[PDB]
Amino acid sequence: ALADNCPLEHNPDQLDSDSDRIGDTCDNNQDIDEDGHQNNLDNCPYVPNANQADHDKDGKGDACDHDDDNDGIPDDKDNCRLVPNPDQKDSDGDGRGDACKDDFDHDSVPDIDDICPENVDISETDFRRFQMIPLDPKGTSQNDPNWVVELVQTVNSDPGLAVGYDEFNAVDFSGTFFINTERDDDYAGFVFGYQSSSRFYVVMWKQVTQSYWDTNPTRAQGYSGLSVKVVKSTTGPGEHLRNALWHTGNTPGQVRTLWHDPRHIGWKDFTAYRWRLSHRPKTGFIRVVMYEGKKIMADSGPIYDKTYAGGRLGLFVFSQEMVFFSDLKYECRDP
Ligand SMILES: [Ca+2]
Ligand SMILES: [Ca+2]
Ligand SMILES: [Ca+2]
Ligand SMILES: [Ca+2]
Ligand SMILES: [Ca+2]
Ligand SMILES: [Ca+2]
Ligand SMILES: [Ca+2]
Ligand SMILES: [Ca+2]
Ligand SMILES: [Ca+2]
Ligand SMILES: [Ca+2]
Ligand SMILES: [Ca+2]
Ligand SMILES: [Ca+2]
Ligand SMILES: [Ca+2]
Ligand SMILES: [Ca+2]
Ligand SMILES: [Ca+2]
Ligand SMILES: [Ca+2]
């Protein structure tokens, strides 16, 4: 019943106020392991497992299942952990069973070309599907985001997101953004570990330092440079989150800035930038590097934070028109 009508992916015809893909009628926000799946809709309630992998579909996610394929051979001794193979046949004796030698998760996409080799639910990128989420559908300081298609955001808008469909535990995420205009000097970036419109990590880059023109609800000063922040809003999309996202630092009950480039180097107009992000939920590892061609423009260095155990990936925009995103790529890094 719940794991049938609750998920927006099973029935999109319902409300989902916090944009976490769980219908309002079922949403209770109880998530003890903070992996983005509430307790009663988590196949491993106490073990962090954001992608909810369950290869034998027995109700116990791989993360809390001792025999992920139910073939009687425990994971630790199974030479084909995700493919049933009782005889453990291994004709060349390399420790990998014949049953899964070319396609470990049996999603019909060989290991080498499979971006998520140990996840039957993901085999290729599908960033052809975006969920647009306005970060301030309350205030009207500026018009909300407008997206078109090269995914472009055309308005000097209020903050907003464009988030993908796939969910990840450990992941490497890369992409390209281009500001096709010399007008303005604000924000462009991306998100990862996205769970709800009140829960996600965000990486943003501003061109020139500037204080947000509306001192309400809180004073916000955004410095030029790359920043890494974690959002845990007590209010959700609105004016409070708005100013907090802009502020280079911490805003009570809204945002925490984990790192900011000490050099405050802003992005350049009409320049293609490539970002490379690595997130390892198990240890809380986070690192983002920005590139201008083959040149390194910014490097966050190792950052550690375990607020969120995983989630979706997406694009971020805040008061910057003509932001062109393209060539998005991602790969799972599990275990
Ligand atoms: Ca919801
Ligand atoms: Ca929720
Ligand atoms: Ca959970
Ligand atoms: Ca879990
Ligand atoms: Ca299972
Ligand atoms: Ca397991
Ligand atoms: Ca099992
Ligand atoms: Ca097994
Ligand atoms: Ca097996
Ligand atoms: Ca073998
Ligand atoms: Ca595969
Ligand atoms: Ca796969
Ligand atoms: Ca608005
Ligand atoms: Ca500019
Ligand atoms: Ca500006
Ligand atoms: Ca602006």
Question: Within this chain, do residues 181 and 211 fall inside the same structural domain, yes or no?
Answer: yes
Contact between 162 and 151 (Cβ < 8 Å): yes
Task: Specify whether 4 is located in the same domain as 33.
Answer: yes
Cis status of the peptide bond prior to 335, with omega within 30 of 0: yes
Instruction: Spell out the alpha helix ranges (H) of the chain.
Output: 2-5, 239-246
**Where among 111, 127, 143 does a domain terminate?**
127
CATH number of the domain bearing residue 142:
2.60.120.200
Boundary residue ending a domain (98, 127, 156): 127
**Contact, 281 vs 170, CB < 8 A?**
yes
Contact 120, 104 (CB under 8 A): no
For residues 256 and 94, give the distance between their C-alpha atoms in angstroms, rounded to a whole number: 47
Please tell me what DSSP assigns to residue 46: T
- Same structural domain, 178 and 205: yes
Query: Please, which experimental method was used?
Result: X-ray
CA of 177 to the centre of ligand 4 (A): 33
User: What is the CA(28)–ligand 11 centre distance, in A?
Assistant: 35
Q: Please write down the long-range contacts of 119-127, taking CB distance under 8 Å and 24 or more positions apart.
A: 119/51, 119/53, 119/332, 119/334, 120/53, 120/55, 120/82, 121/51, 121/53, 121/166, 122/166, 122/332, 125/328, 125/329, 125/330, 126/164, 126/165, 126/166, 127/164, 127/328
Instruction: Using the mean position of ligand 7's atoms as its centre, give its distance from the Cα of residue 53 in Å.
Output: 11
Same domain, residue pair 180 and 325:
yes
Q: What is the largest CA-CA distance in the chain?
A: 69
Boundary (domain end) residue, out of 127, 142, 171 = 127
Which range of residues forms the domain containing residue 5?
A: 1-127
Quote the ligand 2 centre to 24 CA distance (angstroms): 8
**121, 260: one domain:** no
Q: How far is the CA of 57 from the centre of ligand 8 (A)?
A: 13
Same domain, 8 and 47: yes
Question: Ligand 9 is a single-atom ion; what residues have CB below 5 A from it?
Answer: 69, 71, 78, 80, 85
Reported residue count of the chain is 335
User: Cα–Cα distance between 63 and 103 in angstroms, integer?
Assistant: 20
Angle (CA) 202-204-207 rounded to 5° is: 170
Resolution of this structure in Å: 1.9
Cα 18 to middle of ligand 15, angstroms: 28
Cα 212 to ligand 16 centroid, rounded to whole Å: 9
3-state SS class at 72: coil
Query: How far does residue 159's CA lie from ligand 13's centre (Å)?
Result: 8
Domain count, the chain: 2
Question: What is the CATH classification number for the domain harbouring 40?
Answer: 4.10.1080.10
Other residues' Cβ atoms within 10 Å of the Cβ of residue 102: 12
Residues 182 and 103 both lie in one domain? no
Determine the distance separating the centroid of ligand 6 and the alpha carbon of 46, expressed in angstroms. 14
Q: How far is the CA of 72 from the centre of ligand 9 (A)?
A: 8
Give residue 25's Cα distance to chain centre. 25
Compute the distance from residue 85 Cα to the ligand 9 centre, in Å: 4
Task: Judge if 122 and 38 occupy the same domain.
Answer: yes
